[PDB]
Assembly symmetry: D2
Homo-oligomer: 237 residues x 4
């Protein structure tokens, strides 16, 4: 179908598809089946920050989610992304809900990808940063339930006007421009993505999470991906 690499933040365990029985962060390579996961003491109603980072050299893909004044969960998995991904991709943030529900507000999102070549400073590069989202973001492709303008914030999931979240929503947000993520002849290729989010839920149990993801250029939301699939994968299979 469409190739998907993503870093997932399960607020909701899904022991039927494999997810551990605790709020976790994890690395998904073409399958909601995480190839590596780590325990995340999630904080309800607090603004937190995720850093994603990968370099050709280590071939190690990494992520750190962390709150102020709080321990930070980290995950790392050796993968070679030119085998996996197409030469041109498009990056973005995705998030969704199920029975249980949560606010998936993205307060800020940045990202940087460099292609340093065999001759140095013959590099190629793209960096893009949002610390507030305007009422109309010409350069974000918004998919599903995604809405901007609410308090200068990106809401990937749907929320009622009073501020309570709603269930069984998928919204997904993408950068307008395609990213040349890797090349046949580059000595180092790298890419970092940082984004801060606010997850607050009225219910004691929230669901399902946020994921930063990378896919081929022409990606649209999978049918019936609402819930534990996070708007990234069509099937747990």
């Amino acid at each position: 179908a469409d190739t998907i690499v993503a870093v997932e933040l399960d607020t909701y365990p899904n022991t039927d598809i494999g997810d551990p029985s605790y709020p976790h962060i994890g690395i998904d390579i073409k399958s909601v089946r995480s190839k590596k996961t780590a325990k995340w003491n999630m904080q309800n109603g607090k603004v937190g920050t995720a850093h994603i980072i990968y370099n050709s050299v280590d071939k190690r893909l990494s992520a750190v989610v962390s709150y102020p004044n709080a321990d930070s969960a980290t995950v790392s998995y050796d993968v070679d992304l030119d085998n996996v991904l197409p030469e041109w991709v498009r990056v973005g943030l995705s998030a969704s809900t199920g029975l249980y529900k949560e606010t998936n507000t993205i307060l800020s999102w940045s990202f940087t990808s460099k292609l340093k070549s065999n001759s140095t400073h013959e590099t190629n590069a793209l960096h893009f940063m949002f610390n507030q989202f305007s009422k109309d973001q010409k350069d974000l492709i918004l998919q599903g339930d995604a809405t901007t303008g609410t308090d200068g914030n990106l809401e990937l999931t749907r929320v009622s006007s009073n501020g309570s979240p709603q269930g069984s929503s998928v919204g997904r947000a993408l950068f307008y421009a395609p990213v040349h993520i890797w090349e046949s002849s580059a000595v180092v290729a790298s890419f970092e993505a940082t984004f801060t989010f606010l997850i607050k839920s009225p219910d004691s149990h929230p669901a399902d999470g946020i994921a930063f993801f990378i896919s081929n250029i022409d990606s649209s939301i999978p049918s019936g991906s609402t819930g534990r699939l996070l708007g990234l994968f069509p099937d747990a299979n």
Copy 2:
């Protein structure tokens, strides 16, 4: 029609529309009629570098074209670009020929725009750099005669396979993503664009030039803009 701000490099004087009688650089605000110009000792067959820079603070738009081991022509004109331009634009390089002809090879092109807001480091930003152009550039919108892949270079104007240029060509190249160039509430807005080019002509007199330009999102090439209009303006009027 479509609003156009651009820095022009006339290799060919056009004294019928106003252009001075020497190879010049100049500032065009919605009219091929340059509002300020400066003398440029152009160098045939040598790689040269243009720097464009503008900040909300000075409200002064500036450009410098310069060769290695050679004097550098500079131009500057006070303009306030939120009055002129739409809130969202799209940037790019344009170039064309007439009776006389030239190669308009773009060896590299970068650009950066920042929106620092009334609260600091609540900024918004986009930077993008090409030091080589691949056979297929997914993220460049190519218009008219524009072609990439030839020796890792962007050729805005048409060129025969042996390497000689051809006449009465317009090619124009644009960044896929729209640039949020200014905002109603930002204490400093700024944007810098740098690009290196190679102009070589078999004929003693070459024509017409290269221009970096900014326009509304939906800009396409004007009809009959080939020649002294540089693929930017429909009429000298």
Copy 3:
């Protein structure tokens, strides 16, 4: 008589040396008397942001001070800094109180310097940023009363443990490294600086101010410079 260039922020108008009546920002090029100024609707106890930007192309030095939800005071002055300044400088911040007094608290400070040249981005550069000041900052030079570590802030003037400002206080903080501020052979020579500050006085009347300055590598506080001279100038010439 070390050479010194600066962007000053006067909370105290010293009418005999030329300070306008109203609290102003100004450009001080080699003398305390400001070459140009602009009215500044200062806000007591609110954090503000200073932006400062100059480049070899415009040859305009300029600056904007700005509080949230309030107009921003701006100023510009056409000056060629390679005439005025040595080839190699140190950059830094200064502030001072006299009979009247204020809290000169620096919350954050960053600075960029590029020497782009004729070739394909064969430039020389330096950038540094502080959103928190550590308890021992060994890459700042601390001069006078200046202190770090309290709340992660830089305090250029002396304050009590309760927080009360003191009178007749003078403090400077310089980046440890020397900056290559201009070159004989570089086609453009941009440099940008940004910083935030907190100014609060119990008093009806606060004094004197903060200034971003640039001077020689060997620069030290001029004697008897507390008060009107902001730790910058020996005399009021």
Copy 4:
């Protein structure tokens, strides 16, 4: 016994201290004997590029050396540098010859250091770049035989006016400022370095090599370090 971490590039294998037979690159963590290495198909007289990249999340230090149109030699090592290194270091380059000798010419060198934290990009950072070395570089610390200004290059080992390398030579160059390399409270602590170099010997056999190193602020050349120790380590322990 100053503390020191480094990425070494051996043209001369010193088999008794563990250098493999073949010319190698390696990670030297607190001792000259390399913790891990990889074969390097060195090219005489051709400029090459070294890339070096480490981050607190992976906790992997790694590096790639690369010539145009040739495979690139790579190496990695899992090490937690805040255990090994002091909180505040200086970075720099070192190289040396012994009985056998080579030209250790540094054409260009850049370095980035970020201390991203838990908050919304409230980080601390430093970046610097050199594509040309000036005649007097007063923000490099020059140690040993190291010299600037010849062709705009850095020469870490001594060379004649004709260009002939010399034997038993040792040279280091450090950035003037101290780097905050890690923090107790920072959630990630990335740092990246890049540099190009020219290595040429008249001989069949060249020696010894160049190394990027990190050490304490007060670090100076260890005595008797020419030859195998590359200006880095007092002893071969």
